[PDB]
Design a protein around this nucleic acid. Structure first.
Ligand SMILES: Nc1ncnc2c1ncn2[C@@H]1O[C@H](COP(=O)(O)O)[C@@H](O)[C@H]1O
Ligand SMILES: [Zn+2]
Length: 641
RNA sequence: GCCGAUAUAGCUCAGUUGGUAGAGCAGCGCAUUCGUAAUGCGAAGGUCGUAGGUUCGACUCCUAUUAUCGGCACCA
């Protein structure tokens, strides 16, 4: 066939060739770097034959794809070893994953951190042998036969219920060991030297909490020892960014055994919270919303009417009086509708935008609590928009804009967008869902927002647009969201009066921009690593003296800053100016004002950043204008940087 | 909720070998009045998450429990 290489060059062969064969033909080096090849776009083992013309490319550890191939092979290496150490182990699923791979295994013996260390040792041993990985395509029968005779019940299920009974599934052979799933594998283990097992945990078979929980063993793997070590290094650096840490170090809040999953906001944490509170408010005024507030508990009936009670009563908290059962609200929808139902609304009142910083309480899974990210009590910055279907487009778009508008103040660079389509269990006609799904989609496109569908998610009453942010270790956390609801306002019997003097049920849009205030603070803390932007900073300025001398000057100096609207505390402790500077820089204070005699009756003040950067002595009234400005504009960077 | 692990002073961390819990920092006391990331000396401090149990003896072993860490599942 004729082969066309990355440089347009062509090569002619009179019989089927493999990318490996072609590799040699090109050079002994490239041949030796070969892991796999990319033929006419698809990825195939370097040993697969290329019958007809094709565009070739050799996959090398330089390739992002090689990396994954390598990681996948290590996953097989683990199976190889694991089976030598405890031959009764059943292999389930072992896939590549970000930074590595894992393997779910059914073993009737709880793997201790000692065993996991024994495994990694055996593992490194087999990989050093540098053996060859051999591929062999076969019938869906001998393949089944193979694993049935090997005792692998799981590989069998996958085989007879996930693979076309009329297939030539390829088996991979690592000396005595055999695995069999797609994606190309390594030529020989010479490429699988750098790797390390990490954690281990239970994982349900096939993701169902009703199935058996197997043991999942996680690992990392790279092309070179450098890359691997830089990774582990990155993990360490990441741990110093965790909000639970910084949170404690900076005294932002705490939680206790007696109120699991409920935050106690200490003064400094609450300053941050109240700050986002005014920030949001300023935005609600622009986009023109009303701000209301409803009760914390309401008669359960309201949740029965919407259907929430049936689908979520076990994740809901309730209370009782002699003659009444209440619900501590899980969300603010029903209560806002209650307000809507107050007078008589006409089509002239729409679109009605009603917002609330509402306190939600949900009884989350005990195993799911996570710092400020996943709590049992939180405050949602949500709002519900009551409008006519004609107004949807315009309204949804308004939301989309508001989201990126706000996230841009914090300079987030990774916002991924999802479109959650109808769940299996929902309410509403299939015509309704198409209406809704398409409306969101279109609004997304009309705004040029790339996104992926997420089949199955989406509230029982409507589809959702989910904006998700990431944390220190790149885990996903849903934040802003937009739901299109055509079913609830009717169950809660809400209506306006149309032109024809007829009653119409409004279209309701549920939307939150930050998500929950606790989870957003969770995210900001890790984004700034505790180095909050002057406007969000608990304490903005610390003014210190060097000796009693300057003290009386420092006080009226700090007082001057307070009357100017700057969160400023005065450090007059009898200690070394160096002891102080260390403290507050550690505590992440943005600006530190120093006062030696040279400043006292000299007017000025000695300004320095927390990044470390003497800005030199400057004019009082000037540092004030300068800060009030940094603040007023909620800027990410500080003075002269 | 599930699998595994962890829980020691205000914080960080020993004692994770059954034979009286021990450090640095912080706090307290005295001294030090100092020019941009930690001043010196001193006297003290927990009863080992909680409840049971085994044991001559338990921080160490066992059970139950609560929370937390790492995942899975869940996430209106
Ligand atoms: N348990 C929780 N803890 C903290 N924030 C949450 C929690 N559940 C939901 N959120 C946030 O609130 C938003 C709206 O939640 P939901 O009303 O369930 O759509 C989510 O997108 C998250 O940002
Ligand atoms: Zn809502």
């Amino acid at each position: 066939p004729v082969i066309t290489l990355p440089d347009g060059s062509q090569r002619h062969y009179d019989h089927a060739v493999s990318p490996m064969d072609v590799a040699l033909d090109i050079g002994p080096g490239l041949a030796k770097a070969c892991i796999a090849g990319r033929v006419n776009g698809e990825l195939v083992d370097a040993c697969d034959l290329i019958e007809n013309d094709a565009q070739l490319s050799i996959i090398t550890a330089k390739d992002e794809e090689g990396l994954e191939i390598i990681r996948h092979s290590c996953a097989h290496l683990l199976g190889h070893a694991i089976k030598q150490l405890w031959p009764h182990t059943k292999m389930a699923i072992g896939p590549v994953i970000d930074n590595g791979f894992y393997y779910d295994v059914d073993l009737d013996r709880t793997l201790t951190q000692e065993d996991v260390e024994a495994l990694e040792k055996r593992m490194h041993e087999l990989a050093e042998k540098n053996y060859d990985v051999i591929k062999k395509k076969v019938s869906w029968h001998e393949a089944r036969e193979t694993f049935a005779n090997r005792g692998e019940s799981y590989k069998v299920s996958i085989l007879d219920e996930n693979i076309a009974h009329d297939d030539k599934p390829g088996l991979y052979f690592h000396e005595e060991y055999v695995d069999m799933c797609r994606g190309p594998h390594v030529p020989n283990m010479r490429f699988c030297h750098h790797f390390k097992l990490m954690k281990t945990a239970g994982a349900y078979w096939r993701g169902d909490s009703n199935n058996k929980m197997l043991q999942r063993i996680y690992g990392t793997a790279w092309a070179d020892k450098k890359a691997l070590n830089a990774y582990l290094q990155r993990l360490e650096e990441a741990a110093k960014r965790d909000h639970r840490k910084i949170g404690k170090q900076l005294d932002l809040y705490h939680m206790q055994e007696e109120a699991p999953g409920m935050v106690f906001w200490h003064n400094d944490g609450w300053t941050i919270f109240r700050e986002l509170e005014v920030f949001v408010r300023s935005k609600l005024k622009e986009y023109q919303y009303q701000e209301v507030k409803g009760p914390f508990m309401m008669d359960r009936v309201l949740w029965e009417k919407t259907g929430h009670w049936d689908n979520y009563k076990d994740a809901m908290f309730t209370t009782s009086s002699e003659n009444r059962e209440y619900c501590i609200k899980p969300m603010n929808c029903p209560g806002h509708v209650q307000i809507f139902n107050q007078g008589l609304k006409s089509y002239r009142d729409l679109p009605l935008r009603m917002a609330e910083f509402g306190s939600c309480h949900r009884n989350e899974p005990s195993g799911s609590l996570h710092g400020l990210m996943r709590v049992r009590g939180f405050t949602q910055d949500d709002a519900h928009i009551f409008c006519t279907e004609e107004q949807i487009r315009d309204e949804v778009n308004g939301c989309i804009r508001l989201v990126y508008d706000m996230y841009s103040t914090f300079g987030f660079e990774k916002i991924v967008v999802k479109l959650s389509t109808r769940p299996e269990k929902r309410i509403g006609s299939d015509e309704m869902w198409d209406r809704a799904e398409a409306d969101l989609a279109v609004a997304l496109e009309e705004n040029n927002i790339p996104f992926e569908y997420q089949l199955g998610e989406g509230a029982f009453y409507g589809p959702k647009i989910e904006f998700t942010l990431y944390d220190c270790l790149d885990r996903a956390w849903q934040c802003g969201t937009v739901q299109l609801d055509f079913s609830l306002p009717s169950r809660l019997s809400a209506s306006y009066v149309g032109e024809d003097n007829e009653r119409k049920v409004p279209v309701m849009i549920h939307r939150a921009i930050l998500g929950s205030m606790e989870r957003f603070i969770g995210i900001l803390t890790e984004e700034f690593a505790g180095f909050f932007p002057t406007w969000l900073a608990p304490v903005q300025v610390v003014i210190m003296n060097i000796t009693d001398s300057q003290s009386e000057y420092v006080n009226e100096l700090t007082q001057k800053l307070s009357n100017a609207g700057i969160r400023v505390k005065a450090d007059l402790r009898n200690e070394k100016i160096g002891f102080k500077i260390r403290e507050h820089t550690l505590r992440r204070v943005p600006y530190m004002l120093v006062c030696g005699d040279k400043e006292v009756e000299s007017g000025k003040v000695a300004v320095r950043t927390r990044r470390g950067k003497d800005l030199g002595s400057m004019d009082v009234n000037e540092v004030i204008e300068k800060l009030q400005q940094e603040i007023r504009s909620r800027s990410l960077k500080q003075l002269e940087e």
